[PDB]
Structures are given as structure tokens and as C-alpha cells.
Design a protein around this ligand. Structure first.
Ligand SMILES: Nc1nc(N)c2c(OCC3CCN(Cc4ccccc4F)CC3)cccc2n1
Lengths: 286, 289
């Protein structure tokens, strides 16, 4: 660990459905957030285990049904662990359990209300520029188009432990700066968006043997961070923000802009916002 | 100590969720066993004390203030809930099976040339829908009705929603008008029907279950499970199957699509997933190569 002596302060969030926990702890006594998530199963190793001597412990039995506790060997026990240190107050609110509300943001709303709210915020995306500038994660890059205007870096997302294809998850981060979200897209960006889609899919084919009809390829709105990026996920993975209230398919985004240059300037977008988000109030009053 | 069979040989992964950390395995033994494995929730006290005391971490990568690891915790954190069905009837295998899907981008032309003729090659009875609409069956289940034959609908709960909690709220709106198979048939003629579903459907859920519209995901499926126009009202906190961008279409945006673009659902390419063994997939692929 990059610190010593974690002291619990608050379980920020806890999900039995996702088997994931978000903890705020004090260290070096400085705030840190530790995220722990049980990992996906490896089917061949589990099968191999079931045909041997697995450590089982019968909970109950009812004729054809029986429920056990299983304690696999060390290799099958991997827990996905993410540390954010030093953590800011942003991070402590961000990962907290809150209730979401749906909101329909018109094209006027965006430029008059949402954009000025975003522009009033001082956001950190140094991790994004570290990837682009080859300061971090240089040799994790699966593909890069180095053109400053229409180029991008395709790289595994932090969520993905990379140990199985079932939850395959890569992000494409564009080299061009100042494109914050889906709202900023015009026909100017068609060649970049097309590069991401078609070059992103070929790289994933060549690297992972995953065909394009196996990929759900989308952007988030609202995004979690404001530097345009596209998510490449296995269709069988119920991936983060893949619901219709957040995910916008790249193929569709390209075609929307081809039919109507002002699409993402003019059209109402629908998305979820946290109850304690000041943006939610500002949109509700306008 | 031991399982009730020998030689567990994997036949098929019936189901897997990477998000839920669950796998349903079909194995031959010795003769059909289903082993269902689910990783368990975290116990906070065990994590908290592990993290103060000599944890076995291994770095995946770091960047700035972020770092990810592989943690191999001690025994108490490693419990995997393991359910065995043995023997497994075909009914078991079929209820745990979801075939893997493939994406297809159907053009307006593909729908006319390929998908619609395939649909008309099949006979699928929707009589159960008409029996609800005509009040011969499930009249006691209807929560709201606009009885108008052109612009009206029926609001009925999902059959898996017991109405014991608002968390998994799920109702369905079925229109009185017949002949609207799917999204592909929608025109500005149906806008009064569609605004009634959205606005009256939301108002009736507010009044009955005390849930506001900004708590509701209101959407159509394409492809639909049955070809008589219907809409899903779910709680936002309920990420129910079918609400993925690749199947779901928000009713609000469908209304507005047709408001500024009359022939959208006849002209535009729609994206959906088909089961790998679905003969409609084959046709569409062959017609696109
Ligand atoms: N390749 C790669 N990919 C990433 N996504 C990286 C990274 O991401 C930071 C976080 C920022 C927040 N989220 C999503 C999120 C999850 C829970 C709660 C709120 C959220 F916004 C996305 C991941 C941070 C640092 C390095 C990263 N490297």
C-alpha cells in the first residue's frame, strides 16, 4: 500500500448485489478511499476444482437441491482492490450512496444552465493526460492513433482486471483537448468518432479475438469525467452506465450527427443526477 | 465434504453475470447437474481489520492518485455460495439458460426486406393481450385505463412484481389500438397514444404507488418480446433486464423523435441483439455481407 494503518471512518457505499464496498479510511496519522470488489468467476478453473476435492460445507439439502459454502484455493479468491490517495472531499461525496433523479435537459438548458455550472468547476483529469502524454500506463495501450485532432488511445478501463473476457472493458480517450462530453460534438468530430469506432473494434478483434457484434460501444451522459471518451464492453457484460438513461451508442451518435449537424446542440438529453447535486436544482428551476 | 457425483465435466455455461459475480454451470456427471456459484457480500469488519494488518496485495497498475491491486484475502472473505441441482431436468437447464447474444444494426431497408418477411413467416398468438384489452382476463390486475380505442391503453403490473415494495417497481402499458407491431410502425399518428402512455402512466403510478416521474424509466423494447406495442415503467433504482441501451428506447425521446422527424422509425437504422441461434440473425448477416 502507498500508506500504512488504514483506520475506518465511514462505509461510503455497500452493495450485496454487486459484491462491492467503498470505504473511507484515515491513513498516515490524510484521507484515502479503498474500493473492494469480488471478481468474476473463471469457468475452467472452477470446473477443474469441482471435479477434485473442493473444500465444501453443506448448508442444507432438500433432495435434488443442496446449498454449500465453498472455500476455493488462493488463486480463485482474487478481490479487485482500488485505492484513491490522497482523496479529496469530492471523492468522499462522489462514492457515497445517494438516490438518483431523472432529468430532461434541453439544448438551451445546457448552454444557459449546465455548461456555466460545469465551467464554474475545477476538475482534475491528470490521470487522463498521463495516459495521453505517456506518463502512466504507457505499455497497457492496446491501440493508438497519434493524430492530435482525430487520434486517440484505446486502453483497458480501471474497472477491468483483464483476467477474463466476460467483463471486457476498454476506453478510447481522444488526444484532442477541450471536448467535455456528448454535448460538444458536431460534424467536426465525425472523423475522430469514426476512427474510435472502426479502429477501436479492429484492435479488439486482433488483440482479444472479440468480434464487433460482441461489443457494446457507447459514451456516458452525464460522463463521470469531462474529457470525451467511449466505452468498449462485451455485450454480455451488464456494464457501468450501459442502461438507456446513460449510454449513447457511438454508431448512433455518428449517424445522428450525419442526419442533423446540430443534433447534440438542439435535442433534449435524458440522464440521472444525484439528489444532492446542485445541477439538479438548477435544471428543475429552468 | 463432498459433492453427490463424480467427474463433473462442463457441458455449457448456462448463465454468467460479471456484474453480479454469479455463474450457472451445466455439467455432465458419472447425469445433468447444475452448479450455481455466487461470490458473497463483504463483511466490513473483516475488510477493516485485513486492511490494518499485513494484506496480500499485488499491483495491477497506478496512475496519479489511483492504484488497483489483486487482493487474496484470508478464508473468511472467500466464501462462495454454491447451489447444486442434481439431477437437472430439461426444465432446470432451460430456466437457467440464456443464449449469448450478437449485435445487429438493422437499417430501415433491412427491416422491410429481411426482418418483416421473417416475422410474417411466423404465427405467434397475441390472444392473451386482446383478452386483457377486452376485459375477459386480468381485469382485476389493471391499475389504470384510458378506454379510448385509438389513443388509449391499459396499465398492468409485471407478473414478477408482487407490489410488496417500490424498489423493483415494474408496470406495463398495453395500447387498445391493434396493428402496431413495434417501434418500426410508429408515425406522428401515434403521438397522442404515446403521450397518454407517458403522461397518464406516470400520473397513475404517482397516485397509486406514490412514486414520482423522475423516479421512473419509461421505455419500449426493440426487438419487442411480443408484437403488439407495449411500454415498460420501472423504478430508476431497478436496473431490470432489457433496460440496456442495446434494447431499450425511452418513450420521451421516441415522442420527440417523431415530433421533429416524422419518418424516423421507418428511415433510421435501429440496433438490437439477437440470440446466436436465432434464424433472423443469419438472414440479416447474409443480407449485409
Ligand atoms: N485505464 C484507466 N482507466 C480509468 N478509468 C482510470 C481512472 O478512472 C477513475 C474513476 C473515476 C470515477 N469512475 C466511475 C464512478 C464509480 C463510482 C462512483 C462514481 C463514479 F463516477 C470511473 C473511474 C483513474 C486512473 C487511471 C485510470 N486508468
Amino acid at each position: 500500500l502507498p500508506f500504512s494503518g488504514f483506520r475506518l471512518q465511514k462505509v461510503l457505499r455497500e452493495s450485496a448485489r454487486d459484491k462491492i464496498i467503498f470505504l473511507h479510511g484515515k491513513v498516515n496519522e490524510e484521507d484515502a478511499v479503498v474500493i473492494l470488489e469480488k471478481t468474476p468467476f473463471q469457468v475452467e478453473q472452477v470446473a477443474q476444482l469441482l471435479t477434485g476435492s473442493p473444500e465444501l460445507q453443506l448448508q442444507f439439502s432438500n433432495d435434488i437441491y443442496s446449498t454449500y459454502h465453498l472455500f476455493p484455493p488462493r488463486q480463485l479468491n482474487d478481490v479487485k482492490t482500488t485505492v484513491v490517495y490522497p482523496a479529496t472531499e469530492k471523492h468522499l461525496q462522489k462514492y457515497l450512496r445517494q438516490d438518483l433523479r431523472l432529468i430532461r435537459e434541453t439544448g438551451d438548458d445546457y448552454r444557459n444552465i449546465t455548461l456555466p455550472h460545469l465551467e464554474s468547476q475545477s476538475l482534475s483529469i491528470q490521470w487522463v493526460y498521463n495516459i495521453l502524454d505517456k506518463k502512466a500506463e504507457a505499455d497497457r495501450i492496446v491501440f493508438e492513433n497519434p493524430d492530435p485532432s482525430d487520434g486517440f488511445v484505446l486502453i483497458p478501463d480501471l474497472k477491468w482486471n483483464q483476467q477474463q473476457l466476460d467483463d471486457l472493458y476498454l476506453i478510447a480517450i481522444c488526444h484532442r483537448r477541450g471536448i467535455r462530453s456528448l454535448r460538444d460534438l458536431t460534424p467536426e468530430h465525425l472523423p475522430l468518432l469514426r476512427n474510435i469506432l472502426h479502429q477501436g473494434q479492429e484492435a479488439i478483434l486482433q488483440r482479444y479475438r472479440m468480434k464487433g457484434d460482441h461489443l457494446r460501444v457507447y459514451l456516458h451522459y452525464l460522463p463521470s469525467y469531462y474529457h470525451l471518451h467511449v466505452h468498449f464492453t462485451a455485450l454480455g457484460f451488464e456494464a457501468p452506465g450501459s442502461g438507456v438513461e446513460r449510454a449513447h451508442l457511438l454508431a448512433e451518435v455518428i449517424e445522428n450527427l450525419e442526419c442533423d449537424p446540430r443534433h447534440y446542440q438542439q435535442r433534449t438529453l435524458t440522464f440521472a443526477l444525484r439528489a444532492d447535486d446542485p445541477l439538479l436544482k438548477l435544471l428543475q428551476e429552468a
